Design a protein around this ligand. Sequence first.
Ligand SMILES: Nc1nc2c(ncn2[C@@H]2O[C@H](COP(=O)(O)OP(=O)(O)CP(=O)(O)O)[C@@H](O)[C@H]2O)c(=O)[nH]1
Length: 466
Amino acid sequence: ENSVAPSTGELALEDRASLRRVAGLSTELADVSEVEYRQLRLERVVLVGVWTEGSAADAEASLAELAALAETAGSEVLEGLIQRRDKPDPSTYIGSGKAAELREVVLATGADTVICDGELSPAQLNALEKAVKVKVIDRTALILDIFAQHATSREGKAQVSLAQMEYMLPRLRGWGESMSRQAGGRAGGAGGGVGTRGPGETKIETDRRRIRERMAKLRREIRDMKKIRDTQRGSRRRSEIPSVAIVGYTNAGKSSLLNALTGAGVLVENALFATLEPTTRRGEFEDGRPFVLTDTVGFVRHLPTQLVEAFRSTLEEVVDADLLIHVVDGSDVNPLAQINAVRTVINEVVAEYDIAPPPELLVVNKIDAATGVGLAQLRRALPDAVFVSARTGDGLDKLRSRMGELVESTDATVDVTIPYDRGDLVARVHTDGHVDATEHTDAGTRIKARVPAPLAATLREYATFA
RNA sequence: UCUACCCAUGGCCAGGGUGAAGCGCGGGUAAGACCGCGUGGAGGCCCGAACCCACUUAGGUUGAAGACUGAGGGGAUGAGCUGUGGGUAGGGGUGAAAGGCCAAUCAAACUCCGUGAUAGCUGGUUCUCCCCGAAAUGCAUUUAGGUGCAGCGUCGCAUGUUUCUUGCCGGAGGUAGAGCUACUGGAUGGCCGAUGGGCCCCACAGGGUUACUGACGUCAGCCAAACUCCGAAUGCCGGU
RNA sequence: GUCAGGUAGAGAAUACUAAGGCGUACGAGUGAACUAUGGUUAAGGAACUCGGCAAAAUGCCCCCGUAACUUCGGGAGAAG
RNA sequence: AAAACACAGGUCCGUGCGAAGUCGCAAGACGAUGUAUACGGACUGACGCCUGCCCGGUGCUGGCAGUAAACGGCGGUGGUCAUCCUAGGUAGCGAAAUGAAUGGCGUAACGACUUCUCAACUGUCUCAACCAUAGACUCGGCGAAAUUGCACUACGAGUAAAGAUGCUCGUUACGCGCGGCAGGACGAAAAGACCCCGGGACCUUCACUACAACUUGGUAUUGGUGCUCGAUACGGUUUGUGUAGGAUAGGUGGGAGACUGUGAAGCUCACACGCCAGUGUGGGUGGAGUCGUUGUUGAAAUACCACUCUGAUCGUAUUGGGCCUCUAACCUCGGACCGUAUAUCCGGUUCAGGGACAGUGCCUGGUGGGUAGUUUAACUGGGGCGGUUGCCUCCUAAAAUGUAACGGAGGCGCCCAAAGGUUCCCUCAACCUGGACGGCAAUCAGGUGUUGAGUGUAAGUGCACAAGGGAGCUUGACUGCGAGACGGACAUGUCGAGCAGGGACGAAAGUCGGGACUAGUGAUCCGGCACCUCUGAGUGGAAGGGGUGUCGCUCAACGGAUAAAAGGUACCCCGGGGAUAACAGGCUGAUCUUCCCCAAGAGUCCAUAUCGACGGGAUGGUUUGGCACCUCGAUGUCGGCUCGUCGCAUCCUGGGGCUGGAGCAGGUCCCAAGGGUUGGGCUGUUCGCCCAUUAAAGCGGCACGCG
Ligand SMILES: Nc1nc2c(ncn2[C@@H]2O[C@H](COP(=O)(O)OP(=O)(O)CP(=O)(O)O)[C@@H](O)[C@H]2O)c(=O)[nH]1
């Protein structure tokens, strides 16, 4: 450019941001012992994203999410290139100044792997590939691959496959044929719910006709596994046991809490989304009533829009709850970015299924290893919260106390006396009603029990006034 | 003589509306523009018969008809329709251009001639009995549904068991099988245990001795079209 | 190509008729279904359907009254 | 019948006048009885809007001045080519009714155009009924046609060239008619238009080869004058370095005479040469002999020549090219007369213009789809796209040879003057030991080391006896041959003992006609080059031919159609094919569909109320497929309508078990096919979405039933 729209000194329209090959942390790197063959850790993925929003500090966690995605998905990151583009690029994504830079960046990797962050229309992916000719899958395809490798239940192996088909259907030509040509089991290779390839050799399939047919069958099957789930939850619904759910960002001790308060024993792997199918377990409020506890799947910033069906059961558990719990990973940078996304998910849930929002119990987790990011009322960034340490079980008592006190009691506290002949009633109050205490009176007892509705009218006749 | 276009010379277009220029009276206006009122009758104007077309629908669809009928439809003073007489002719004509039309036919008319065109393609090829009796393979092919040569039939002449079967004898294999501690590779479980780690007491030595891992071997149990230390049965080549 | 009666009518349209010319060359029956061409229809009124295709509707004369827009001519027989 | 063509309007290009353009071989014609405000061709298509930074000079019309992105540049930058003022239909201006500001927006009126909505109306429909006429039907008369192997021509389930009136086993059926329906006779009709193969046709082009047309030149018509550059012929003293030197000498053969007193040698000077070798020309007091083979230089003498040529460029004869003209050939559709009463024809005479130009002939190059004749491969699990095509090596290949696939892996189109021949000698790879660099690791020593290294090059077969590693000498990487065989359609391809001649190496025996072996290549024709004793169109020669050796092809589609060749056809046509595709049928069941088996787990505890991973086994024949068996001398497609009929894998209704069945209501499984299973708006929908109901708004087969 000699005199074309005078912009000398930039060639990228931005004084500071322009072409931003920061390589600040260089994402992250690995170490020895990944040296058996070349496919145990091969996709030395380079990352790229657009700073199109506020502080690059709050966007650093955004690319940390992608780095963690790659780490849990297997293949280890090798480089990261975050562009300070003012606004998202309309047709391409890289910046058109890095359209050549990308190749000389990726000559430093180990195997062909470049990853974008935002969801890319096929318009992007038609030339973003031609930029380097190396397979590029965005963050949504990475989430779909993670779930594909983590799917284990029949329901999940259909929801994940449907989500992948619904994501790949728009971007069939070009990109779709690109991973059709590339059949080695890459990061985009996914696998569907099989995980151990199977349809992984077909990846996300290629044919639009075949995709459409399998999509119709999967729609029908997911329809069936909702009138299965309603049956399975009927027993809880009919008994109206007080339900408590645990939501929040992934890796925030969401399953460790449910293995901590109650001795459930669910998988607690360190990687990202692993408890991909909701599981619920019984529990007793320390003082009185019993309850049920449910741990959900896991939320992410800018959640993929093809995974709402895979999250549908999670949403159902969220709606059918009394005390919602968003667990925040205390020992992590910016412990609020997770919170805003989780909350936003909550609003879209309460909107899609119109219901009175339930109280949201707040717990900060991993404060045992935290360096006190606030170390004050600053650490009380949300002043209402309980600082539990699931790795050590510190706030369990305080949590177990306040969670019940914040669930509300639908009991009926009465004072009743029972002549000894009808010890059946004494036993029924002592095993169903959660009696506080009493003194063992001459003929009866001064029982002060938070008796329920079935026995409320039972004990009305044998009442007392003292 | 149909149709396309052109030339010469003739004819036809019921009826009913609208109302251009111009002109006049004027006004209007400084005057002009213009505005009113009259006359006037223009227009590839309007509605609509004859006429010329052919938009829709139904019928016909071995028709009444090798392109029509019924009902509606478009133009109908015009780049109009039409009579009579002419002109342009085939790689040519004409074409408000459709590969349209040029005598019921047009991505090159018809007729006769070259001419009995040619067709690796299709069809057809007419009486009897007797004797023998296939092939659908190889090679080559502007070749793959054709053909050339070889193989297999038959007839004749020459030779005469040379053919074939069985027994015996002499042969070369690397198949079936099996084996791998005999090569090249895969691979299971131990034992031996280098080294690397092991890193602490604390030396930096030496020790403990590594969740360890692990050279090197070693034992056991396996695998292979393109592995063979091995290795048949049949078949094949000679002799008898 | 020539002629173009009468009444109704603007009309060479249409209907009925004068002059004149014809009954046009297979007939006779018969309430079959069905097909064609006509006719009518309760109550709804395009629900039919690819699609108001087809049919139905409007239609004449005289008085009034006539929109957006406009190339100032028209629209316009507006509509009513 | 239109959105296509045309159109008025516009823009560009060409044309100065029997014009350009077109028809004709030409003459001639139209253009036009016109004349740049006109005519021809090409694009666009009323009308409007969008839209130049402002005039110096590459230059232009020329008289300085236009001009606009006439050419830049939008740059300062007015401004709005106006003062000054810069060699991209362009981001000028970068201005969203909408990349077009020469291509996009608008646009009144108009349209048998396309797509929607409203009001009115209606048998279009709910959902039909009735009436008349013309057929149909009956009676009398006349009286066809396509079709046709047959015939006292059933149905089910099978079988069969895989869809049976004809076959098999059963079930049903008295003989002959009439009126109707349209499910079959793969009904009739048309030697399938789709698809493939072969032929053709017409079209296109930077396919090949030609031609027309245009055009560049040479020359003939075609001549004269001059200038004019010289391509021209014919002669010329002095000049001329080894020149031996009476001394810077062209010979030559005559050579002994010429120069002779107007002037010998010797000269002296101006000037050529200038290599002062010093010759000389010319000029000058100038003369009264130097001379010459004087043998002299191979050789004159500056004595001559007759030549030779050698001086060194002056005259000298014809001659090309250029320029200038001129008239006389030739040309004029410029005029005037005459034949000629008639005459824009034609010819003749004459004047006026051109004029050796043009036009035309023969020759010669260039452009040349304007036109023609033709080419444009085959294989192929249809064709196309993609790949391949010859040679070598493995596996397939079933222990001889051979053996296919669009089966599994690779290589080659060479390299080497030594990496060939011979003689002689040697042994590796790896391991251990210990030595400065030195390291697991360059070199050294010792020890193990029997083949695991190497072998130019792929792979295989081999080779430690070495074919592997060295050194010496050599060219057998020969000539004339080759008994006998291998492989073989043929053409090719191989091996070969041994003989003779001349060699190499080795003392000799003996080995040597390329390389451990198997790839490294191309027939024939045609034509080069060298040698030879062949032959030489009457003869002698030569030309040409012949023989021997050898050379020229990615003729790689590699047994090689021509030396030379790409496409389109939905405008297509013919000849064939179910040898081969699209629909349907048939086989398979990968895919699909419905279940089942084991039980990790989920389900508040809880494998099995409801679900069920990881794996396995099946049914069915509805999806997409795979195959290519029937049909290409025709088996008419999707959807909708009408009419159905059947299965159950049951949507509703009916009967049961379990339940995480308290009741109400559900979930799941079993039994159950009698009946029923709505009407609309959107969608090609094939699918589906939406609206209002319903007991419910089932899924499927029947050529995806039914033209
Ligand atoms: N140090 C520490 N680590 C914790 C604490 N709580 C949870 N973690 C860690 O978080 C990790 C993620 O395990 P998990 O409990 O599944 O977290 P999660 O949020 O449920 C991840 P998912 O959403 O996929 O189930 C575990 O490895 C666990 O060790 C804590 O209090 N301290």
